[PDB]
């Protein structure tokens, strides 16, 4: 038994989950076996009246194995099959003649939760790493081991749905009061053995005392829900009330999903069709509709985005020589404070610098508020916050720069400026100090020109808002050093970002691929189509943001700044609409933030329910007419997508994108590429490496523009080829 161990004490068995690698205990087929065996022993053995099961591996409790999900994936019901065989095991546990206490140490997600959810008594540690959740959804699937049946029964219909729809992890304490966990235990300080280890021991020791007691049938001291929970829970007994809940939820999912994702909808069913019909009807609906999903195109796509994310959270270049211990951000703007906060709270002693004291405050405020909000959300102590905020030493002049290990520029998009700063800074920072530039348009070469040491100059293109976003596009020039990169990557990862590395370009992978769309957008808006229709046309195609309201938000002017700066560097294929109407906005006085159809009520930038009253007048002035085979609503969509997908695959071709996975991760996490599609490189593999070109040639010759497939795109088309696999 390389996974599940054994051992006994008194009339209480003590199972011990620990995978061979030990890194994280996942539910393997062979593990399932060992376990299924160990139970039968303690089950039948008259020597044992009760039992416990805890994780020896410190990292976590259980995670659920993706090992054999798409691997042993043969038929639609070779998966469905699996689900059942799992349901069967846990049902044995649930309906056990001997009490079984689940001692949950660390991570307990998906499968793992669906087990402790079957056991008699759940006991979990009050740790941050101790999370419970059903992220099955996130991979386009759903809980395939009773989760759809036991959670509703255990934690009410609402929370049980939320938990299985959002896939949100639940904090230990939250999980306790929520009714998911029966009992809680705080982790221990140092002792004879290290904390983790001694803690685990304690947890076991406790789980046992409970186990023993449960066997003796001594558990009549339950808790009280109160008056609110007693009512709401009762109200949930009434069938026509539950209907109104399944409806209000389905509606909310439907509309926030745009309806492109299947799992979230099929989960609402399996829960209903199990608590409205028999559990037997449920479990076997879950089982079937599980595999039914695993085969869905979306799920396939999201599993790919999941995996890419695993890699993109690991250091491509391994550890650097010097671990950045002293950081310095340049520009207490938005993306400065944003960046600062993401660094300070991690423990990195950072230095925020700006010109005027006024602008040094705004930044200092954000990074404060940011922490302070994290306190209210119950994620940070008031003390932790205040303390963390001390690590943030803000200033106007470079005082401590003498000791900077890394430096990050976050000033305007002006190369003249970017140079002035690089010069100044490089004149006061040590030799080993890296310099990174948070830019989108300007290349890291034309900036690293003035560099006294361009080996130490590397691009770090963060994404806004840096407070919440997690994509980080690390640019690399040829002169750029390997270790200089291996540090920049290690910093972004500490900042807790998902990292994609690209070779320097004129408009790097992200901004570049974005451009052609923003042109085609202008063109469409100038073709008679309007915001509402375009926003709706893209959002409903899977886009997180409406193509037009994307712009009206991003920068009506910062549109031109890059549309033309990057249109001059290419202009060939990027030639879409007339950037005059784009100018006619700025010069005639139009902006995202006020005037342009994406405004908000009173001095609080409040509500929406409004567009623009005039951009109609100026739009009407200069606007071409539609086409025949390209004016279609479905065409208007692929017009955009294809152009993007092309420049994307082209960036792989040109060697800018190291991998297709990265290409995808960045595209979805950063550009807002519809994830159901799975990324532009997945979208090729699934939608059709050919069908995508035929669709592209139809928006090329038919639209008299050189918006034509590149080599590597058309390369995959002329054969049965796929990038990812």
């Amino acid at each position: 038994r390389t996974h599940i161990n054994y051992g006994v004490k008194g009339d209480v068995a003590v199972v011990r989950i620990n995978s061979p690698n030990s890194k994280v205990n996942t539910l393997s087929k062979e593990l399932h076996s060992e376990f299924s065996e160990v139970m039968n022993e303690i089950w039948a053995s008259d020597q044992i009246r009760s039992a416990v099961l805890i994780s020896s591996k410190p990292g976590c409790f259980i995670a659920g194995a993706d090992i054999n999900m798409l691997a042993a994936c043969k038929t639609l019901q070779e998966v469905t099959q699996l689900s059942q065989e799992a349901q069967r095991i846990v049902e044995k546990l649930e309906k056990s003649t001997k009490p079984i206490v689940a001692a949950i140490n660390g991570s307990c997600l998906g499968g793992g939760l669906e087990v402790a959810i079957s056991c008699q008594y759940r006991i979990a540690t009050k740790d941050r790493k101790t999370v419970l959740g059903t992220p099955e959804v996130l991979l386009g699937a759903l809980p395939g081991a009773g989760g759809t049946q036991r959670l509703p029964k255990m934690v009410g219909v609402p929370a049980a749905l939320d938990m299985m729809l959002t896939g949100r992890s639940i904090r230990a304490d939250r999980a306790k009061k929520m009714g998911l966990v029966d009992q809680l235990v705080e982790p221990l300080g140092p002792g004879l053995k290290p904390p983790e280890e001694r803690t685990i021991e304690y947890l076991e020791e406790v789980a046992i005392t409970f186990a023993k007691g449960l066997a003796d049938k001594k558990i009549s001291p339950k808790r009280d829900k109160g008056l609110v929970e007693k009512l709401t829970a009762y109200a949930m007994t009434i069938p026509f009330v539950r209907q109104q809940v399944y409806k209000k939820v389905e509606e909310k999912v439907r509309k926030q999903t745009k309806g492109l994702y299947p799992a979230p909808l099929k989960i609402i069913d399996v829960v209903k069709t199990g608590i409205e019909q028999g559990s037997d009807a449920g479990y076997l609906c879950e089982s079937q509709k599980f595999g039914e999903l695993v085969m869905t195109k979306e799920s396939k796509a999201l599993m790919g985005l999941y995996h890419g994310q695993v890699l993109c959270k690991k250091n491509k270049f391994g550890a650097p020589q010097k671990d950045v211990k002293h950081l310095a951000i340049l520009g207490a703007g938005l993306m400065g404070a944003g960046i600062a906060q993401v660094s300070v709270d991690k423990g990195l002693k950072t230095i925020l610098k700006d010109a005027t004291l006024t602008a040094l405050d705004r930044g200092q405020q954000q990074v404060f508020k940011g922490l302070n909000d994290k306190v209210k959300k119950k994620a940070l102590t008031s003390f932790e916050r205040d303390s963390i905020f001390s690590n943030l030493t803000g200033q106007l002049d470079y005082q401590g720069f003498e000791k900077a290990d890394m430096v990050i520029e976050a000033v305007f998009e002006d190369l003249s400026l970017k140079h002035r700063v690089l010069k100044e800074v490089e004149a006061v920072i040590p030799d080993h100090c890296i310099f990174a530039s948070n830019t989108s348009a300007l290349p890291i070469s034309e900036i690293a020109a003035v560099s006294k040491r361009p080996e130490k100059v590397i691009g770090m293109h963060y994404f806004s808002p840096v407070d919440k976003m997690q994509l980080l596009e690390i640019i690399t020039t040829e002169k750029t050093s390997k270790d200089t990169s291996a540090s920049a990557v290690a910093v972004g990862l500490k900042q807790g970002k998902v990292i994609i590395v690209v070779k320097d370009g004129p408009g790097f992978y992200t901004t570049r691929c974005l451009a052609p769309m923003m042109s085609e957008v202008i063109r469409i808006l100038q073709e008679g189509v309007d915001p509402k229709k375009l926003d709706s046309l893209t959002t409903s195609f899977g886009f997180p943001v409406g193509a037009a309201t994307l712009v009206d938000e991003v920068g009506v002017d910062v549109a031109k700044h890059v549309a033309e700066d990057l249109g001059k560097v290419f202009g060939e294929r990027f030639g879409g609409g007339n950037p005059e109407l784009l100018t006619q906005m700025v010069s005639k006085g139009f902006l995202g933030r006020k005037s342009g159809k994406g405004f908000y009520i009173y001095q609080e930038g409040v509500k929406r329910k409004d567009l623009n009253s005039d951009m109609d007048s100026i739009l009407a002035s200069l606007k071409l007419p539609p086409k025949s085979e390209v004016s279609s609503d479905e065409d208007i969509q692929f017009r955009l997508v294809t152009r993007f997908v092309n420049e994307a695959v082209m960036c792989l071709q040109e060697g800018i994108l190291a991998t297709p996975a990265e290409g995808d991760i960045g595209a979805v996490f950063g550009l807002g590429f519809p994830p159901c599609l799975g990324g532009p490189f997945r979208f090729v593999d699934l939608y059709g490496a050919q069908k995508i070109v035929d669709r592209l040639k139809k928006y090329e010759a038919a639209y008299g523009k050189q918006f034509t497939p590149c080599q590597l795109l058309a390369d995959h088309a002329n054969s049965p080829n796929k990038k990812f696999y």
Binding site: P187, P190, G191, L192, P195, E201, Y202, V206, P221, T381
Partner: protein
């Protein structure tokens, strides 16, 4: 021995008010009222002249806002001079210690010859409105100054109990104990020792430090209240008090809320003898330390004991008398474990081998805080005072007093008997 060119400092005599269970009989008193009593008990017993007292300094944690400088206001009421300046010092459980240290420092410094240290603590809190009392800090447009507040106000309550870094004092005990695998049975056990070993010492009358005290309300008090030993079968029949329901720490194996005060006359040897006194001990070496409050706040002694023991140049063996602070049964029994682990010593303490488990037979022989009581910043004296007191009536030369404190801190001192 003791150091040469640095002048020697001794404790002439010390004292303390009986240590009563909070809300018992000091209920209707103010903290400075006890301090006054302690200072009078000292000033009476020690017969010091009111004139020669050069400086007074008292410790205390919870402040009576009316008597900010508790020492200075108790000093005047007691009798000590107008000249005799004083200041109040606050350092959690070991505030009474800092009093003596801060005082001793001024002696060896040369800044003065005679000082009175001590401390006081009254547990019967004072909870406020953190802003009921702010639209309250505004003391025909005047009437409507308050509509401006009555716009929607909801005051309620205050704070005080946990810890400014989050966590109950005793809650840490229950998981500091489990951290070092200290069993419930092991705790109820020691608890019972100190309750019995105190009651014994009380009956024998070894508790000399305690001066009686006439309260205006009650009859008068001589004895302590925490003397209540039970059967071990009883202490185990009890429920947990900080981590429920699988807790190891109970009410019976924990200390309790206590009202009390303590005074002490410390002065330089050359003066003590010239004054015609018969000093009770030397105030030898000492050391203040600090921990990480979050996960190891009650491990003061374990970090403290060595630093001072080596700085003076002795060992667990040179010491024949241990008076430690008894915050919780599981606090000590666990501190022991840590002192007795080479692992812990190597890993955290950053040293060669373990500190050395003090002989559980030379340890708190006339009971401790768990049985007598723990008035924050008034217990620091009762220890050193009942250390030099043991060295005389039991015999010995070197006593080690140490104490764990909130704030994630700790203090240890070496007491050398006197011939």
């Amino acid at each position: 021995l003791a150091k040469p060119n640095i002048r020697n400092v001794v404790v002439v005599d010390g004292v303390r008010t009986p240590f009563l269970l909070s809300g018992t009989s000091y209920k209707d008193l103010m903290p400075h009222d006890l301090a006054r009593a302690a200072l009078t008990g000292l000033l009476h017993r020690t017969s010091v002249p009111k004139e020669v007292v050069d400086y007074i300094i008292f410790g205390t944690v919870i402040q009576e806002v009316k008597t900010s400088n508790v020492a200075r206001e108790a000093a005047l009421g007691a009798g000590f001079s107008d000249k005799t300046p004083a200041h109040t010092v606050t350092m959690a459980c070991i505030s009474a210690n800092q009093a003596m240290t801060t005082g001793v420092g001024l002696i060896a410094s040369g800044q003065c010859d005679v000082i009175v240290a001590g401390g006081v603590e009254l547990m019967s809190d004072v909870p406020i409105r953190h802003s009921r009392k702010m639209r309250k800090l505004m003391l025909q447009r005047l009437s409507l100054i308050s509509k401006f507040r009555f716009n929607f106000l909801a005051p309620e309550l205050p704070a005080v109990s946990e810890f400014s870094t989050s966590e109950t004092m005793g809650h840490s005990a229950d998981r500091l104990a489990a951290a070092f695998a200290v069993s419930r049975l092991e705790q109820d056990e020691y608890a019972l020792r100190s309750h019995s070993l105190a009651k014994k010492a009380q009956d024998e009358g070894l508790l000399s430090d305690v001066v009686p005290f006439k309260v205006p309300g009650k009859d008068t008090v001589t004895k302590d209240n925490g003397i209540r030993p039970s059967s071990l079968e009883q202490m185990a029949k009890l429920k947990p008090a900080f981590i429920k329901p699988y807790g190891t720490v109970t009410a019976a194996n924990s200390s309790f809320l206590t009202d009390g005060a303590s005074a002490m006359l410390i002065m330089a040897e050359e003066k003590a003898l010239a004054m015609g006194y018969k000093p009770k001990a030397y105030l030898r070496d000492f050391m203040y330390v600090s921990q990480d409050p979050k996960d190891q706040l009650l491990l003061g002694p374990t970090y403290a004991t060595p630093k001072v023991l080596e700085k003076a140049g002795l060992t667990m063996n040179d010491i024949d008398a241990f008076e430690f602070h008894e915050a919780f049964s599981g606090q000590i029994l666990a501190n022991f474990k840590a002192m007795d682990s080479d692992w812990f010593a190597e890993n955290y303490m950053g040293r060669k081998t373990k500190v050395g488990l003090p002989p559980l037979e030379k340890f708190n022989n006339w009971g401790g805080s768990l049985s007598l009581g723990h008035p924050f910043g008034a217990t620091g004296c009762r220890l050193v005072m009942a250390a030099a007191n043991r060295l005389r009536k039991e015999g010995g030369q070197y006593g080690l007093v140490a104490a764990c404190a909130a704030g994630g801190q700790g203090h240890a001192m070496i007491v050398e008997a006197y011939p």
